[PDB]
Amino acid sequence: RGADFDHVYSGVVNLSTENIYSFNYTSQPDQVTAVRVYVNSSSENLNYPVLVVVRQQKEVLSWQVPLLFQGLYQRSYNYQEVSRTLCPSEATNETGPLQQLIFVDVASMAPLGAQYKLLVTKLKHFQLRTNVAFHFTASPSQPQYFLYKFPKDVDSVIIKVVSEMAYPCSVVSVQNIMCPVYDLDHNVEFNGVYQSMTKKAAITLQKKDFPGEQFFVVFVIKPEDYACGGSFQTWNLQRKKNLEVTIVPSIKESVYVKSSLFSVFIFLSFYLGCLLVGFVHYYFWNIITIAVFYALPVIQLVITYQTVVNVTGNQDICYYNFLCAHPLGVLSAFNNILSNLGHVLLGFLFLLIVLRRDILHRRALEAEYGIPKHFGLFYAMGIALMMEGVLSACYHVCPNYSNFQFDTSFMYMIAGLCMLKLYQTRHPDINASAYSAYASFAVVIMVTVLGVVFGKNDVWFWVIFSAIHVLASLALSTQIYMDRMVLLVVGNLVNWSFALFGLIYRPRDFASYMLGIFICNLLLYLAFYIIMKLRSSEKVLPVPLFCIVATAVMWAAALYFFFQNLSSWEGTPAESREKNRECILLDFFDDHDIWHFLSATALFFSFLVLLTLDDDLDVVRRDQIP
Amino acid sequence: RGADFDHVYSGVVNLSTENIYSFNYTSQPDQVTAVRVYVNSSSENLNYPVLVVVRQQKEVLSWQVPLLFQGLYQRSYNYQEVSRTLCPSEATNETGPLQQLIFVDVASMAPLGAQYKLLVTKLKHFQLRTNVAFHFTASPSQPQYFLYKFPKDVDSVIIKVVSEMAYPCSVVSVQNIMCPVYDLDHNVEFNGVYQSMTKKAAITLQKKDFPGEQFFVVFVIKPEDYACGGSFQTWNLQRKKNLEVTIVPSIKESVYVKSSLFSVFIFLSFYLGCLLVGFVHYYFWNIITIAVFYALPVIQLVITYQTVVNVTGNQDICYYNFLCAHPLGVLSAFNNILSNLGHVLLGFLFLLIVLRRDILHRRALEAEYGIPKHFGLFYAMGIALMMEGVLSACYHVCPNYSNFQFDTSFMYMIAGLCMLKLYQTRHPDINASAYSAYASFAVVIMVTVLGVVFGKNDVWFWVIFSAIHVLASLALSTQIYMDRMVLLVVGNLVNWSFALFGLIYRPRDFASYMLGIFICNLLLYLAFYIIMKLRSSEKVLPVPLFCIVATAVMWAAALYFFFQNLSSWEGTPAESREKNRECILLDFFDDHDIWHFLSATALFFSFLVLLTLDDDLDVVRRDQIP
Ligand SMILES: *[C@@H]1O[C@H](CO)[C@@H](O[C@@H]2O[C@H](CO)[C@@H](O[C@@H]3O[C@H](CO)[C@@H](O)[C@H](O)[C@@H]3O)[C@H](O)[C@H]2NC(C)=O)[C@H](O)[C@H]1NC(C)=O
Ligand SMILES: *[C@@H]1O[C@H](CO)[C@@H](O[C@@H]2O[C@H](CO)[C@@H](O[C@@H]3O[C@H](CO)[C@@H](O)[C@H](O)[C@@H]3O)[C@H](O)[C@H]2NC(C)=O)[C@H](O)[C@H]1NC(C)=O
Ligand SMILES: *[C@@H]1O[C@H](CO)[C@@H](O[C@@H]2O[C@H](CO)[C@@H](O[C@@H]3O[C@H](CO)[C@@H](O)[C@H](O)[C@@H]3O)[C@H](O)[C@H]2NC(C)=O)[C@H](O)[C@H]1NC(C)=O
Ligand SMILES: *[C@@H]1O[C@H](CO)[C@@H](O[C@@H]2O[C@H](CO)[C@@H](O[C@@H]3O[C@H](CO)[C@@H](O)[C@H](O)[C@@H]3O)[C@H](O)[C@H]2NC(C)=O)[C@H](O)[C@H]1NC(C)=O
Ligand SMILES: *[C@@H]1O[C@H](CO)[C@@H](O[C@@H]2O[C@H](CO)[C@@H](O)[C@H](O)[C@H]2NC(C)=O)[C@H](O)[C@H]1NC(C)=O
Ligand SMILES: *[C@@H]1O[C@H](CO)[C@@H](O[C@@H]2O[C@H](CO)[C@@H](O)[C@H](O)[C@H]2NC(C)=O)[C@H](O)[C@H]1NC(C)=O
Ligand SMILES: *[C@@H]1O[C@H](CO)[C@@H](O[C@@H]2O[C@H](CO)[C@@H](O)[C@H](O)[C@H]2NC(C)=O)[C@H](O)[C@H]1NC(C)=O
Ligand SMILES: *[C@@H]1O[C@H](CO)[C@@H](O[C@@H]2O[C@H](CO)[C@@H](O)[C@H](O)[C@H]2NC(C)=O)[C@H](O)[C@H]1NC(C)=O
Ligand SMILES: CC(C)CCC[C@@H](C)[C@H]1CC[C@H]2[C@@H]3CC=C4C[C@@H](O)CC[C@]4(C)[C@H]3CC[C@]12C
Ligand SMILES: CC(C)CCC[C@@H](C)[C@H]1CC[C@H]2[C@@H]3CC=C4C[C@@H](O)CC[C@]4(C)[C@H]3CC[C@]12C
Ligand SMILES: CC(C)CCC[C@@H](C)[C@H]1CC[C@H]2[C@@H]3CC=C4C[C@@H](O)CC[C@]4(C)[C@H]3CC[C@]12C
Ligand SMILES: CC(C)CCC[C@@H](C)[C@H]1CC[C@H]2[C@@H]3CC=C4C[C@@H](O)CC[C@]4(C)[C@H]3CC[C@]12C
Ligand SMILES: [Zn+2]
Ligand SMILES: [Zn+2]
C-alpha cells in the first residue's frame, strides 16, 4: 500500500493479517534526508506484542512494541512508543537524484488482534550546524542521532551537550557514516567514541580520524541509572530527557604556542629578576630515589590507561576536565601537564640561589658572626619542588581512582621538609637520617590511601584519626618548647578546630584534607617564628619582608583556586562531568591549572622565607641569643 | 505457505514479490526444541542483498544475506551462509504441550531478482549433558549456542572448550535463559560472562547466580584476529572453527579443607621437627616499611580489577590459570593465594630459630672462641621471606601487566640480603645502612619494569644491559678478594655465559631473567664459600651438611616447576589461555602453586646454610685464621 509522509496511520493486526506500508521519496544530490518511524501500541497484552519490520534496499530493521527492558535486580519496563531513525543514503553529484523505497511491515500473533498507530516523517533539522545550539528530546525507546559535516577551515571540533536535569542517565556516542548506526543499549559502545552523561558531556574530535570528514552524534537514554549515580515523577511511563547540543570549533595552533610561551616566560622572568638583584650587590640524591621509586607504579599504569581510552572509545576512565582538555599527540589534556612546568622551573631556580649562597659561603670560610648556615635541606627542598611537578604531570595523563594521591601527595614531603629546616635554624643538634624521611613519608601515604578507600567516610576511621591528630599536635608543641606558652596553646586550638571540622562533616576527598593539615601547620610554625623574632629585639630585613607578604598573597590566591573542583573521582564519571568548566586564562588553562601555577609560586616564596629570615643575625656575633 | 522442517526451499525474489514460509511444530512439556534457520544466496550483487525476517510470537529477528563486516584498516568481508538459532520457549508441566508458529519472510529489492536457499531444522543435540564432550562447528556468520541444566547434586560447573587450531579468534559467552540471546559481534559482551579464545577456554560458574539453574553457552566467531594475537587458507570464504565443549562439575567443599590442611600441616611439620632437635640437645622494621610502601600501589589497584571482572563479565583482565582457578568468595583463584602460606610460615620459623640462637648467645656473654655472631641481617631475611608471600598473594588476586613484578621482585631483596650476610661472616667491618638497602633495591626494580616495557625485547636495551651485567661481576669479584684467583674467574664465566644467553635469545619475561641472575650469584658465592672452607682445614658439621644437600635438591626441584608457564601477560589473554593446565596435586594446586611451595623451602634451607655453616669455628678460638 502506497502511503504518505506526516500522516498517522492506525489499524489492527492479528495472526492472519499483516499490514504493509510502502513509502517513496527522492534524495537531492547535495542535501540529506533522514526518515523517522513512530509506532504506538496501547495493548498491554505482553504475550502478543506488535512486531514492526522496516525494509530498505540495503538494510532491514526490526523491533517489537512495547519495547522491553530487563533492569538489575529483576525489574521489567514497558515502553509503548518506539522511534527509530533509518540510516540515510547520501546522494552526490556523481549519482544525481535517487528514488528510494521504504517498506514498513506491521505484524502480530494475537488471536483477538492488536491495535497500533504509525507515523513516518522526514527530519528537517538532521544536519547540525557549527556554533548553533539545537534543542531536542530523547527517550529510552526513542533514540536520536544527527549529522555533522566538517568545514574546510576547521580541523577539530568539540561536542558540548547540556541538560538541566541529572536524570535519566544517558550516553552520547560519535560514530562513522557507514551504515548501520548503533543506537540501542546493547550496541552503542561497540565502535566509536562514547561518554556517559547526566548533565554535561564534551567530546573532542579530529578531522583526520574520519574518512568523509563527517560523523554521526548518537544519543541513547538508559532504562536505569545504575551506571550513573542514582537508581531506578508523575507516572513516568516515558523517561524523557531534554538535551541541547552545540558543536564548537577547537582552538587554533597559535593558541598552543601563545599559551606555552606564557608558561615559560613567566617562570623565566623569575630568573631574570633574581640575577638582576644579584647584579645590584656586585640528601637530594636520597629524595630523587624516593621520588622515582614512588613514581614507577604510575608510569607502568597510566600508559596503559591512556592507550585503552585511545584503542577503545571508552572515555569514562580518565576523569578529565573535558571542557578544558586540549590534546597534543597521545595526551588528551596537554594543559594539565604543561601547567606543572612552574614546579620544575622554580624548583631549579631555588637550587641556583642556594648554590650562590653556598659558593659565597665556602669562599668566606677560607678568609663567629652568625648562626651556622646548613644548606643541606635547602638542596632537599628545591629537588622536592621539582619532583612534585613530575609526579603530578604523570597524574594528569589519566586521573582516576587508582592514582589519585599523585596530584598532591608529594607536597606532604615538601611541607615536612620546611618544618624541619625551620627547627634546624635554632636547633642545629638535630640529626634526621635519610631513612627517617622515607619511613615517615611512607606512613602518611598509607593512612591517606586507606582513609579514602576503607575509611570511605565512616565514623570508625574519622574518630581514631581525630585522636591521632590531637596527640600529634600535643607532641610537636612541647618538642618546639613567658609568651612562649601563649602561642603553643593557640596553635593547638587551630589543630583542634581542624580536627572537629573534619569530624562533623567528613570530607570524602581525604587527600586534600591532608594538605590542609600540612599547610596550616607550616603557616603557623612559620608565623610563630616571626612573632618570636619580634617579641625579641630582632628586626626583619626588606628582602625576607617582601617574601613574607608574597607568601601570604600567593597562598591565599592558590587556596582559592584549589577549592574550585572541576573533576571528582569520588563518583561515577558522569557525575564528575557535571562540574566541568571552560578555560579562564588564554583559552588554555582552567581553575586547576592556575592551582598548579600558584602553588609552585607560593611554595617557592615559602622557601625564600626560610632562607633569608635569619640574615639579621649575620652581622650580630654569636654567643648573644639562641 | 505451510512448509516442512529438514527440507531445502529455493526461490527467486524481487521488488514485487516476498516469499513467506510458515513453520509449525509442538513443544513437549519436559524436553526443549531449538530451531535453526539456514539461508544461502549466491548473488554477488551487493547493492541489493536478500533480507530475511523471522517472526515468532514474542520476538522478531532479521538479517541480510550476504552478511557484511567492516574490519580494521578498511577491509570488508562477505559471508553467503548465515545461520541463526531462535530463542526457545520451554514448555513445563504448568503449561502442557505448546503449538508454536514461526514465520520466515524472504524479501529483496533487486530489479532482476535474487536467488536464495532456505533450510529450517530442529536441533537434536541442543541440551548439553554433564561430563560428555560434544563436537560442533561455528562460523562468523553462523553462531551457535546450547543449553545446560544444573543437576540437583552439582553446585558449580566448569565449561572447558577445546580447539586444535588457534585461528579464527572466537568468544565463548554464558548468558541467561531470558530471551533474546545475544549471539552477534556487537552484543555478545553486553551482559553475562565471556572469554576470548584461540585454543582453550575455561569458565567457572555458580548455581546460585542463575535463576532457573540453567544458562546458555554462546559461541561467536570474530571476523578478524586483532583482538587475539594474529591478523586478518585455500579460498577461505568461511572462517570455520571446529570446537569441542565439556561441562565438568567442580570440586566439592571437602577438597577445600583437605588441601588447605595440607598446606598448613606440611609447614607446621617443620615447627615440630625443629623443636624436636632442640629437645635432643636439652633492620626488620626497616624492611617492613620498604615492603608496605612498595605494596600499597597494588592494594589500591587489584581490588579494582577484582571488582571489574565481577561487576562485568570481562574475564580477559586477570590472566589466571583458568583450569586450576578455585574461587572462595570474592577471590577467583584461592589456591594461588593459599600456596603462598609457606613463605609466611617458614619465614616466621626462621625468626624463632635465630631468636633461640640470640637468647642463648646473650646468656653466654654474661658468663674469644669463635667469629663474632651478628644476628642483624638474620632477622632481616626471615622478615623478607614473610613479606615475599604477602606481596605475591596480592599479585595473584588479579595478575596482569600492571603488577607483574610483584610475583618475584621481592626475591631480589632476599638474594641480595643473603650475599651480604655471607660477606659479613668474615668481613665484619662492613656497614650497610638502611637507606642503601632501599636505594639499591629501587634501582633493580626500575631497570626491570623498563626492560619489560621499553626494552620490549629490542637490541638497544639488551646490549647496554649486557655491559652492565659484565662490569657488575667484575666489580664484585675483586671486592670479594693461590686457588682464590681460580674460583674468581670461573664465576665470571658463569655470569658471562648468562650475559650472552640473554643477548642472543632475548627472553621477553625479563622479571624471571633477573631471578636467574640473583639465584645463580647466590648459588655460586655460597658454593665458593664451602670450597674455601675445604681448601683450608675446616670440616662441615652434619647439621649444615644436611642443609647444603637440602638446598641443592629443593632449588633444582623449584626451578623445574618455575619453567612450566601456565599463564603469560606478554600476549593477549586468549594467547595466555592456551597454556592453562589442570591441577596436579590434590586437585587444587597447579605447577605454579608448587613453585610457591618449593621456593619457600629452598629459600628457608638457604637461610639455614648461612646460619650454621661457621659452627665449626665456635670451638676453635680466635686469632687463628680469618
Ligand atoms: C555539486 O554540483 C553543484 C552544481 O554545480 C555545485 O553547486 C554549486 O557550487 C558552487 C560552489 O559553491 C556555487 O558557486 C557559488 O555561487 C554563489 C552564488 O550563490 C557565489 O556567491 C559563490 O562565490 C560561488 O560562486 C554554485 O552556485 C552552486 N550551484 C548550484 C546550482 O547549487 C556543488 O558545489 C557540487 N558539489 C560538489 C561536492 O562538487
Ligand atoms: C503515541 O502516543 C503519544 C501519547 O498518546 C502521542 O504523543 C502526542 O502527540 C501529539 C502530537 O505531537 C501531541 O499533541 C500536541 O502536543 C503539543 C505539545 O504538548 C500541544 O501544544 C498541542 O496542543 C497538541 O496537543 C500530544 O501532546 C502528545 N501526547 C503526549 C502525552 O505528549 C504520539 O504522537 C503517539 N504516536 C503516534 C505515532 O501517533
Ligand atoms: C512433569 O510431569 C511428569 C509426568 O508425571 C514427571 O515425569 C515423571 O517423573 C518422575 C520422577 O522422575 C518419574 O518417576 C521415576 O520413574 C522411574 C521409572 O522410569 C523410576 O525408576 C524412578 O525411581 C522414578 O520413580 C516418572 O516416571 C515420570 N513420568 C513420566 C510420564 O515421565 C516430571 O517429573 C514432571 N516434572 C516436574 C518438573 O515436575
Ligand atoms: C549453502 O551452500 C553450502 C555450500 O554450497 C551448503 O553446504 C553443503 O551442504 C551439504 C549438505 O549438508 C554438503 O553435502 C554433504 O557433505 C558431507 C560432508 O562433507 C559429505 O560427506 C556428503 O557426501 C555430502 O556431500 C556439502 O558438502 C556442503 N558444501 C560444502 C562446501 O561444505 C549448504 O548446505 C547450503 N545451505 C543451504 C540452506 O542449502
Ligand atoms: C482477524 O482475523 C479474523 C480471522 O482470523 C479476520 O476477521 C475479519 O473480520 C471481518 C469483519 O467481521 C470479516 O471481513 C471477516 O470475518 C474477516 N476478514 C477476513 C479477510 O478474513 C481478520 O483476518 C482479522 N480481523 C481484523 C483485521 O479486523
Ligand atoms: C515515487 O514517486 C515518484 C513521483 O514523485 C514516481 O515517479 C514517477 O514514476 C512514473 C513511472 O515511472 C512516471 O510516469 C512519472 O513521470 C514519475 N514522476 C516523477 C515526478 O518523477 C516513482 O515512480 C515512485 N516510485 C515508485 C517505486 O513507485
Ligand atoms: C519479478 O518481477 C516481475 C515484475 O516486476 C514478475 O515477473 C513475473 O514473470 C513471470 C514469468 O514471465 C510472469 O508470470 C509475469 O511476467 C510476472 N509475474 C507476476 C505475478 O507479475 C515477478 O514479480 C518477479 N519474477 C519472478 C519472481 O520470477
Ligand atoms: C500445526 O500442526 C498441527 C498438527 O500437527 C495442527 O493441529 C491440528 O489442528 C486442526 C485444526 O485445529 C485439528 O483439526 C487437528 O486435529 C490438529 N491435529 C493435531 C495432531 O493436533 C495445528 O493446527 C497446526 N497449527 C496451525 C497454526 O495450523
Ligand atoms: C612529612 C613527611 C611526609 C616527610 C618526612 C619528614 C618528617 C615527618 C620526618 C623528617 C625528620 C624526622 C624526625 C627526625 C628526628 C626525630 C627524633 C627522634 O627521637 C624520633 C624520630 C624523629 C621525630 C624523626 C621522625 C619524623 C621526621 C620529623
Ligand atoms: C613534619 C615534621 C618536620 C615535624 C616538625 C617538627 C620537627 C622539625 C622537630 C620539632 C621538635 C623536635 C623534637 C624536639 C625534642 C625531641 C626529644 C628528643 O629526645 C628526641 C628528638 C625530638 C623528638 C625532636 C625531633 C624533631 C622535632 C619533632
Ligand atoms: C639486591 C637488592 C635488591 C637489595 C639490596 C642489597 C644490596 C644491593 C645492597 C645492600 C648493602 C649495599 C652495599 C653496602 C656497602 C657498600 C660499599 C660502599 O662503598 C658503596 C655502596 C655499597 C656497595 C652498598 C650498595 C649495595 C648493597 C650491596
Ligand atoms: C647483592 C649484593 C649483596 C652484592 C654482594 C657483595 C657485597 C655483600 C660485598 C662483597 C664485596 C664488598 C666490597 C668489598 C670492597 C669494597 C671497597 C671499599 O672501599 C668500600 C666497600 C666495598 C665496595 C665493599 C662493599 C660490599 C661488597 C660489594
Ligand atoms: Zn593537578
Ligand atoms: Zn606466583
B573: which residues sit within 8 A by CB, 6+ positions away? B195, B196, B316, B317, B319
Q: Do A206 and A249 form a contact (C-beta atoms < 8 A)?
A: no
What single letter denotes the amino acid at residue A404?
F
Helix axes A410-424, A376-395, angle to 10 degrees: 170
Helix axes B591-612, B341-365, angle to 10 degrees: 10
Q: Do B35 and B53 form a contact (C-beta atoms < 8 A)?
A: no
* CB contact (8 A) between residue B433 and residue A438: no
Which of A476, A488, A514, A523 for mutating ligand 10's site (highest number of atoms within 8 Å of CB)?
A476
HEC per residue, B277-303: HHHHHCCHHHHHHHHHHHHHHHHCCHH
One domain, residues A175 and A93: no
Which of A27, A28, A30 for mutating ligand 1's site (highest number of atoms within 8 Å of CB)?
A30
Distance separating the N- and C-terminal Cα atoms of chain A: 104
B175 is a domain residue? no
CA of B593 to the centre of ligand 14 (A): 7
DSSP SS3 for B586: coil
Dig out the grid coordinates for A166 from the structure: 541529572
Rg (CA), chain A: 32
For ligand 9, whether the C-beta of A294 sits within 6 Å is no
Q: Is A438 on the interface with B (CB under 8 A)?
A: yes
A487 is a domain residue? no
* CB contact (8 A) between residue B438 and residue A289: yes
B282 is a domain residue? yes
Domain final residue pick, A250, A273, A305:
A250
Q: Do A102 and A56 form a contact (C-beta atoms < 8 A)?
A: yes
**Distance (Å, whole) CA B626 – CA B624:** 7
Beta-carbon count within 10 A of A159 CB? 21
One domain, residues A294 and A221: no
B84 is a domain residue? yes
Quick one: which of A179, A128, A181 has its CA closest to A154?
A128
One domain, residues A300 and A233: no
Number of domains in chain B: 2
Provide φ and ψ at A426, rounded to 5°.
-125, 10
Interface test with A, best of B84, B108, B190, B456 (most A CBs within 10 A): B190
B299: which residues sit within 8 A by CB, 6+ positions away? A449, B394
**Distance (Å, whole) CA B352 – CA B385:** 13
One domain, residues A362 and A448: yes
Ligand nearest B113 Cα, by number? 7
Q: Do A350 and A254 form a contact (C-beta atoms < 8 A)?
A: no
Q: What is the β-pairing status of strands B8-13 and B19-27? A: unpaired
Ligand nearest A119 Cα, by number? 2
Strands (E) located in B436-488: none
Which of 545-574 (A) contact B at CB < 8 A?
none
What single letter denotes the amino acid at residue B160?
K
Number of residues written out for chain A: 626
Resolution (A): 2.8
Dig out the grid coordinates for A113 from the structure: 488482534
**Distance (Å, whole) CA A58 – CA B50:** 9
Partner residue facing A446 (CB), from B47, B296, B301: B296
Q: Is A55 on the interface with B (CB under 8 A)?
A: yes
**Distance (Å, whole) CA A571 – CA A568:** 7
Chain A contact set for B224 (CB, 8 A): none
Partner residue facing A51 (CB), from B55, B211, B443: B55
**Distance (Å, whole) CA A7 – CA A3:** 8
Q: Per-residue DSSP letters for B380-414?
A: HHHHHHHHHHHHHHHHTTS--TTSGGGGTTHHHHH
Quick one: which of A103, A178, A170 has its CA closest to A138?
A170
Give the chain A residue nearest B444 (alpha carbons).
Answer: A293
Q: Is B330 exposed, middle or buried (0-12, 13-18, 19+ CB in 10 A)?
A: exposed
Dig out the grid coordinates for B289 from the structure: 616499611
**Distance (Å, whole) CA B507 – CA B455:** 11
Domain final residue pick, A208, A225, A250:
A250
One domain, residues A235 and A311: no
For ligand 8, whether the C-beta of B4 sits within 6 Å is no
Q: Is A618 on the interface with B (CB under 8 A)?
A: no
Q: What is the β-pairing status of strands A8-13 and A114-123? A: antiparallel
**Distance (Å, whole) CA B249 – CA B245:** 13
DSSP SS3 for B40: strand
* CB contact (8 A) between residue A286 and residue B439: yes
Whole domain around residue B582: which residue ranges? 253-457+507-615
Q: Write down the residue that cell numbers 531445502 correspond to.
A: B8
Give the chain B residue nearest A188 (alpha carbons).
Answer: B186
Q: What is the β-pairing status of strands B127-128 and B144-149? A: parallel
Provide φ and ψ at A398, rounded to 5°.
-155, 90
Q: Do B138 and B60 form a contact (C-beta atoms < 8 A)?
A: no
Angle at B9 between CA B3 and CA B13, to 5 degrees: 105
Domain final residue pick, A124, A152, A183:
A124
> CA distances (Å), B494 to each of A303, B368, B412, B500, in order?
37, 39, 19, 10
Chain A contact set for B182 (CB, 8 A): 186
DSSP SS3 for B135: strand
Number of residues written out for chain B: 626
**Distance (Å, whole) CA A595 – CA A563:** 9
A111 is a domain residue? yes
**Distance (Å, whole) CA B90 – CA B485:** 83
Q: Do A401 and B303 form a contact (C-beta atoms < 8 A)?
A: no
**Distance (Å, whole) CA B467 – CA B463:** 6
Dig out the grid coordinates for B394 from the structure: 596480592
Beta-carbon count within 10 A of B622 CB? 12
Dig out the grid coordinates for A201 from the structure: 558531556
- The residue whose C-alpha atom lies closest to atom 12 belonging to ligand 12 is B479
Q: Do A71 and A122 form a contact (C-beta atoms < 8 A)?
A: no
Q: Do B123 and B36 form a contact (C-beta atoms < 8 A)?
A: yes
Q: What distance in Å separates residue B435's CA from the closest CA in chain A?
A: 5
Which of 263-292 (B) contact A at CB < 8 A?
286, 289, 292
> CA distances (Å), B521 to each of A423, B426, B448, B613, in order?
46, 18, 17, 18
One domain, residues B431 and B578: yes
Which of B290, B411, B440, B525 for mutating ligand 11's site (highest number of atoms within 8 Å of CB)?
B440
Q: Is A212 exposed, middle or buried (0-12, 13-18, 19+ CB in 10 A)?
A: exposed
CA of B340 to the centre of ligand 3 (A): 50
Q: What is the β-pairing status of strands B98-108 and B50-55? A: antiparallel
Beta-carbon count within 10 A of B85 CB? 21
- Experimental approach was cryo-EM
A185: which residues sit within 8 A by CB, 6+ positions away? A69, A140, A220, A222, A223, B190
One domain, residues A382 and A300: yes
Q: What distance in Å separates residue B555's CA from the closest CA in chain A?
A: 31
Give the chain A residue nearest B287 (alpha carbons).
Answer: A439
**Distance (Å, whole) CA B39 – CA B142:** 10
- The residue whose C-alpha atom lies closest to atom 26 belonging to ligand 8 is B24
Ligand nearest A27 Cα, by number? 6
For ligand 2, whether the C-beta of A117 sits within 6 Å is yes
Q: What distance in Å separates residue B293's CA from the closest CA in chain A?
A: 6
Quick one: which of B177, B148, B624 has its CA closest to B370?
B624
What single letter denotes the amino acid at residue B351?
L
Quick one: which of A478, A611, A624 has its CA closest to A538?
A624
Quick one: which of A505, A581, A18 has its CA closest to B20?
A18
Q: Do A126 and A87 form a contact (C-beta atoms < 8 A)?
A: no
* CB contact (8 A) between residue A60 and residue B47: no
User: HSE-up of A180 (CA within 13 Å, CB side)?
Assistant: 23
- The residue whose C-alpha atom lies closest to atom 5 belonging to ligand 4 is B40
Partner residue facing B402 (CB), from A109, A304, A453: A304
Q: Write down the residue that cell numbers 619542588 correspond to.
A: A385
Q: What is the DSSP letter of A429?
A: T
Q: What is the β-pairing status of strands A34-40 and A114-123? A: antiparallel
Positive or negative torsion for Cα A434, A436, A439, A445: negative
Distance separating the N- and C-terminal Cα atoms of chain B: 104
Q: Do A245 and A134 form a contact (C-beta atoms < 8 A)?
A: yes
Q: Is B446 on the interface with A (CB under 8 A)?
A: yes
A368 is a domain residue? yes
Partner residue facing B446 (CB), from A15, A63, A296: A296
Quick one: which of B218, B246, B244, B223 has its CA closest to B169?
B223
Partner residue facing B435 (CB), from A182, A300, A435: A435
Give the chain B residue nearest A57 (alpha carbons).
Answer: B109
Quick one: which of A512, A427, A540 has its CA closest to A476?
A427
Rg (CA), chain B: 32
| CATH, residue B20 | 2.60.120.380
Helices vs. strands in chain A: H and E counts, helices first: 15, 19
Partner residue facing A402 (CB), from B52, B109, B301: B301
Atom of ligand 10 nearest to the CA of A480: 11
> CA distances (Å), B573 to each of A54, A366, B227, in order?
40, 68, 9
Quick one: which of A209, A217, A216, A218 has its CA closest to A155?
A209
B13 is a domain residue? yes
One domain, residues A73 and A198: no
**Distance (Å, whole) CA A518 – CA A370:** 30
Chain B contact set for A300 (CB, 8 A): 402, 449, 453
Chain B contact set for A443 (CB, 8 A): 289
Q: Do A577 and A322 form a contact (C-beta atoms < 8 A)?
A: yes
Q: Is B24 on the interface with A (CB under 8 A)?
A: no
One domain, residues A132 and A120: no
One domain, residues A164 and A228: yes
Beta-carbon count within 10 A of A15 CB? 16
Which residues, in sequence order, are bridge partners of residue A170? A197, A221
Cis upstream peptide for A168 (omega within 30°)? yes
Q: Do B160 and B245 form a contact (C-beta atoms < 8 A)?
A: yes
> CA distances (Å), B316 to each of B143, B233, B280, B580, in order?
21, 28, 55, 14
**Distance (Å, whole) CA A18 – CA A103:** 12
| Sheet containing strand A8-13, strands side by side | A8-13, A114-123, A34-40, A81-85
Which residues, in sequence order, are bridge partners of residue B206? B156
B242 is a domain residue? no
Chain A contact set for B211 (CB, 8 A): 74
What are the b/e assignments for A514-543, b being 16+ CB within 10 Å?
A: bbebbbbbbbbbbebbbeebeeeeeebeee
Task: Give the H or E element holding residue A454.
Answer: none
Dig out the grid coordinates for B347 from the structure: 619465614
Q: What is the DSSP letter of A372?
A: P
Q: Write down the residue that cell numbers 497500533 correspond to.
A: A116
CA of B479 to the centre of ligand 12 (A): 6
CA A622 to chain centre: 54
Dig out the grid coordinates for B581 from the structure: 593446565
Dig out the grid coordinates for B607 from the structure: 637461610
